[PDB]
Amino acid sequence: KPKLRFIERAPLVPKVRREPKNLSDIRGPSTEATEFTEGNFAILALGGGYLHWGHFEMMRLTINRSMDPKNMFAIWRVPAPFKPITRKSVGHRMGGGKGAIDHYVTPVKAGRLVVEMGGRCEFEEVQGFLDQVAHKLPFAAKAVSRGTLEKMRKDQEERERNNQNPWTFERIATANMLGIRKVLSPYDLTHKGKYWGKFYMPKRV
Amino acid sequence: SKAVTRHRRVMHFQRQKLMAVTEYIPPKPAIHPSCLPGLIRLLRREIAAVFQDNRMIAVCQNVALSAEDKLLMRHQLRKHKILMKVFPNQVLKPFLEDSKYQNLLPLFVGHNMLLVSEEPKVKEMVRILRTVPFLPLLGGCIDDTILSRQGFINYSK
């Protein structure tokens, strides 16, 4: 079963309790599915966002059509949509209670792998349609190999080491210099200024 | 507006100043570094063996011929013991000085094809070349003796 598996619109056992839109699940760096497993290539999410069944279908169809089943295999690195998003009836005034469950999404944080590919192939053979899918994804995304991912991580480390700026967001925020914690967020003490909402600034050091 | 927004939220001016001040500054390297200071040996042995074995050697520019014309010329040459050879100039250049062929340097430039043999059928070969008024015979060196085309013609006659 090398081809990418079908993803259901909603969990077979639908959720009954409406739950809040905890955007923290999109905010910040991803702590899961950050490393390769049984594969050499992937789509890395350089930003946070919610994946719908439409995005899942786009990924599945594009990758299945463009891959070579006898030499390539793909695997989801993100769970099927589980977080329920509720929408009220069109033109409804505010109030009256939380809306009914409309769709299901799956959160994705910056730095996560969405799909992972492997098999008897090199990067150039796959990067094309992986970049197509990444560009059509709801967040910034990039087709990345193991080598390229390691290269970008090492480049980030090198920039952090050799930056000539005496002042770093990390230092200033941690020391509360200028009292900038009045303007910053508690999440910023760990994001180090590289994250802003759902957006991940990679050039940011 | 929520902390996480679909658009890049506007930062408080002090946060903007912080981000501008804490930008990555790459290290300036003072002086720009830009303006500071198998098969090959197989064919080496092949060329050495060819030079040693052949008693007479000639060269030409058989590049203007069709595939079939070149094949026919090869067949006519194989009718005699002479063998036509193709080698890259890029690796033929060292061989001249390696084998002590100084006068052969200004002779192998561009397409060059060897006509190595021991029994010269040069008379009939020139006859064959005559009906094709091109593909000039190019200078060679029989038995470590450089011959010009006039020398080859005299030797033929």
Binding site: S66, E125, G128 | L39, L42
Partner: peptide
């Protein structure tokens, strides 16, 4: 070995053709 490089060239041509199938 001449045949080694011949097979290498054939495989490289195969790889290029496979890559160009979509191009």
């Amino acid at each position: 070995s001449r045949e080694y490089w011949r097979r290498l060239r054939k495989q490289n041509i195969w790889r290029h053709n496979r890559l160009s199938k979509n191009k």
